[PDB]
Structures are given as structure tokens and as C-alpha cells.
Amino acid sequence: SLRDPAGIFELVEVVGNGTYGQVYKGRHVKTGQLAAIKVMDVTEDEEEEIKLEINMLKKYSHHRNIATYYGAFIKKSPPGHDDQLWLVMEFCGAGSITDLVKNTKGNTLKEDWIAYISREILRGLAHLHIHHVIHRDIKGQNVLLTENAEVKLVDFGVSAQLDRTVGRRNTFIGTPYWMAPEVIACDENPDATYDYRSDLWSCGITAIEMAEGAPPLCDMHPMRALFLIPRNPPPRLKSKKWSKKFFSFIEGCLVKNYMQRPSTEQLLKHPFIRDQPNERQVRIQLKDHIDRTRK
Amino acid sequence: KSLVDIDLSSLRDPAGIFELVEVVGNGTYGQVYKGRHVKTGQLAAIKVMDVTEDEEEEIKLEINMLKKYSHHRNIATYYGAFIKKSDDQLWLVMEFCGAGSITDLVKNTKGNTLKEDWIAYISREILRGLAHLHIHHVIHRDIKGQNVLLTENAEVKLVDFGVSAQLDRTVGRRNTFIGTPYWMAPEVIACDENPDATYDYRSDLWSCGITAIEMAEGAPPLCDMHPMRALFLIPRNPPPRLKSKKWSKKFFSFIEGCLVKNYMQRPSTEQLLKHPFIRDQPNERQVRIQLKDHIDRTRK
């Protein structure tokens, strides 16, 4: 059964805040080995159901573009309060793509770096989607880089699955900026769907976050952004500097009606993603940029 | 008993002023840790949040936005903001209330329902704390059972981690997150008729009405609905109403006053303090004794 993490894992620094909880750079206490730890409130005394749901999904974390599952821990709380679940995964040494862009001059990545990273996110998502798993938490903070620029998604469907089964009393709306229109309830969409294509919208927003350092509407009160996402036209890159292929990729990700949004396999064939003649050079440049940022 | 080393206008290192008396083992999001005021030995509640070194300028701005207001028996006193350098830790410090929240009170009661005269008493105490904030031009913004605490002496106090500047709702990009919707009044939710969602003093009174339903039924309306769907329905659905017919007409009437959907037609805090459900409490002395005895029994 799920153990208290005391003396096994500790939380060191925050890497992200998402749809269901927070992600930390954590540490295996007695080795000093790093881990990505996703901390999520869960309905109290549901350890058996939690273990069942995690065990059904963990095999999907072995893929090269998914941070590998290590273990799961629970912290108990007073009667009636949600328990705290710690989902422990591998940490990729270079940290998140959001931190990389924050630490880049002009808060912008080179276009061919964005194509490379976006393809790797799409490959991780295609693995989950073919296995009928929705991620539901795609954003720069949830995409980590290793020291040689391998790209891995944090979480492999657990937060999304626990939300829908075990649940919790401490629910919140969360930050809206990576949410697709179908995830936001309105007159035409009163029940707000769970469809794999919502991850592709989030992938488009993440590409804008790599290009501009922040998602669209980042300077707006989140309640006004939540209202505007289903109403506004698809977001677009602000600068004219980008290639027509990059604008075209964003148009594919950011089709507002999910029923008309391309699949993960269709986006992997988009020229922006499919045609990367400078891939080896990009990985060398990313490795060098990670090294320079560190110092 | 006024603390003499408090400074609500500055961001200081907490050394020699406040200390934590437990480890920060549950992360730095929505976590309040037990602390101590070093000079007096008085316990304190310390909300610990991770902050970037660049966020300090925004924190100092928000500190300047804090409004001045005295201590009040129905408000857990805010003791200020501190920075514990390393991301650094921001500490927001407040008076410690040791008997749990109103939500814990109802969750630990048979049938997850409080007696009507306890609800009238607790609701009046919440309204008295709100009247103190509102007269000082402060909106609380987060009235709910979890943010109404009890002391060991059965005093009812609102949580205050610096509500006039919303210090705990902004730092570490917390200002980009929408919390739980269930206690939100319609005016704070953006929609076609309300594109610029705005809090008013009266928004707290809607939340007070939802908190009275929470005491009556154990949970706010729509509590287990997906929050995005609840956010859409609050401006559309009729005012929430108690489900049981057992309650008095005065209690139904008080809920109708709190839960007027259009804030421009919702009564003020001073008007709700005169509502018969709040104003007329012939058993208030006995209710206080019952609450104290319930707290004593729970403790052991």
C-alpha cells in the first residue's frame, strides 16, 4: 500500500502548477537522485483505487518521450480533508521548456528548436492517444529536457484519470491559458468534453509559449481569458519573423472546434514537424544552450 | 494583547519575529503551517509560498495596497509578510485558531448538518467580521466554511492573510489561477452580460449565504459537479435554496437575501445584520456553550 514519503522523497523546488496539482523538482533523500513529483489532492482513504488506476497506466510511461514512473506516496490529513498524493517520475536534468525560454535572451526559442521540441511532444502524445489516454496537462512547465535535449512529458494520464474516478473535494478551475475551447463550459458546450484532441490545442499554445515566452492572453485576468478563449479567433504568433510553415502548424493545432481539429498522427505529418533537415544541429545547439544557461 | 514588533508595511526577514514549529513537508501550495511569535510564544498560522527573486517588486507593490483596519474579534489578525531567503519563501502570518474550521465542524456532526440556531450564530459572527472589513473598504473575497475558524474558546473568526491586497492569491503566478467556483457570486464570473467580472462588498454576502447552506447540508450547492460546469451554471441557475423543508421561514428568508443574483439588488452587510434570522437570537448564550462543549468533546 501507498506510503508516507518522509525520509524517501522530499520536494526541493516548484517546476509547475497545472490542471490538477503542482509539479516539483524532488529528491530521493538517501541518494540525492532527482525526481519530478506531481502533488495532487485526492479523496481521503481511496489508496486501493488510486493504486489500481496508477497500475493500469504506468506501462505507458516507459516511452522515450514520457518521464518514467518511479512510485507513488500518500500524505494523510485531518478527517474530512483530502489526502495528498505524490506521483514520482524521472526528472530530466535540464528542467522545463518554460524555464529554458525564461532563461533565453528575448524569451524566444529559435524556430527549428520549436519544431524539434513540438515533434517530441507530439510523439509522446501519440503514444498516449493510441492507448486511449488523454494527458490533459500539456504546457511548457510539464515538458522537460535532459542535458542532451531529449524531451519528455511529465505525467502519463494519472492526474486526468484520478480526477474522473477517485476525485477530491479540493477542486479548482486552474490556470486557463492552455485550455482548448471544448474544456471551457458555455451555451453550445454545457458539459465540457474529455477528448484527446484537447491535448493538441495545448501543444499549439505550448509552441506559442516557446516562441514568445508566454501563452496568449498571459497579461489578462484569468477569468476574462476563460471567457475569451471560446469567443476569440484562434491565437496566432505576433511576429511576422516566423515561417509560413510555423503559422500553418499553429493553425492546425488551434482549430477551435475539436471535431475539425487534426489528430496527433495528422500533425506529425505537418511540414513544420515532418521536415527537419537540421535536427542533429538543433540537438547540438540545445545541448550547448542548456550548458550555457546552467553557468 | 497587541504584538509590538508587527509591521504591516514592510517585507522583512522573519528571524527573531516568527518561527515555524513543524517541517514544511506538504509543499508550498494551499498549505498553512504551525508557527510561533518568538517574543510572546503565541502560536501563529504561517502560509508558506515559494516566490522567485524577481517577484519581490510585485510583493512590495501589493504590500503598499494593504488597507488599514484594527483588530476585530471576528477576524483572525493578520500579522504581516516576511521573506525567508534561499526561489525564496514568502510567509504570510496570522493569529492561530486551534479548533478547526466551520467545514470541519459540520463534517464531524452526525448527518453533516448543524442545528439552525448554530447557523444563525455563526452566520452573524461572519457578518460582523465582514462589516468591519466592508466599512474599511475591504472585500474579503473568499468566504467559505474552510475560511471561518473556531478558537478553543468557541470564537468565530474569518481567515485574514492580508485580504485587502490578496497577497495569497497572486505570488508565484498564483494570480493566473482560478480557484474553486462554488462560493462565487454571479458578478465575479465572466459571461456575455458580465464581460468584466468584478468583486463587490456584496460578493461576500452571497458567499455568506452559500456558507450557511454549507452548514445546513454539509456542502455548498453543486459541490461535486465539475468546476467548469458549475462556473457556467452559477450565473444561470436560480438562487440556490435549502433542500429540506425542516428549516424555518426566517432561515429561507435569510438565504433569499444573501443569494440575490444581481449584486445591485442584494442587501448590504448592515441590512443583513438586521434580518430577523441574524438579529433575533434568544438562545445565543446557550449556543456558545454548546459550541464550546462540542469543541471540548472533539479535542478529546
Swiss-Prot record, chain A:
* Tissues showing expression: Widely expressed. Isoform 5 is abundant in the brain. Isoform 4 is predominant in the liver, skeletal muscle and placenta.
Active site positions: D137
Residues in domain Protein kinase?
Answer: 9-273
Q: Where in the cell is it found?
A: Cytoplasm
Q: Where does ATP bind?
A: V15, G16, N17, G18, T19, Y20, G21, Q22, V23, K38
Q: Which family does it belong to?
A: Belongs to the protein kinase superfamily. STE Ser/Thr protein kinase family. STE20 subfamily.
The subunit field of the Swiss-Prot or TrEMBL record says:
Interacts with the SH3 domain of the adapter proteins Nck. Interacts (via its CNH regulatory domain) with ATL1 (via the N-terminal region). Interacts with RAP2A (GTP-bound form preferentially).
Q: What does this protein do?
A: Serine/threonine kinase that plays a role in the response to environmental stress and cytokines such as TNF-alpha. Appears to act upstream of the JUN N-terminal pathway. Activator of the Hippo signaling pathway which plays a pivotal role in organ size control and tumor suppression by restricting proliferation and promoting apoptosis. MAP4Ks act in parallel to and are partially redundant with STK3/MST2 and STK4/MST2 in the phosphorylation and activation of LATS1/2, and establish MAP4Ks as components of the expanded Hippo pathway.
Mind telling me what this protein is named? Answer: Mitogen-activated protein kinase kinase kinase kinase 4
What organism does the record attribute this protein to?
Homo sapiens (Human)
The organism's taxonomy opens as:
Eukaryota, Metazoa, Chordata, Craniata, Vertebrata
UniProt lists the gene as MAP4K4
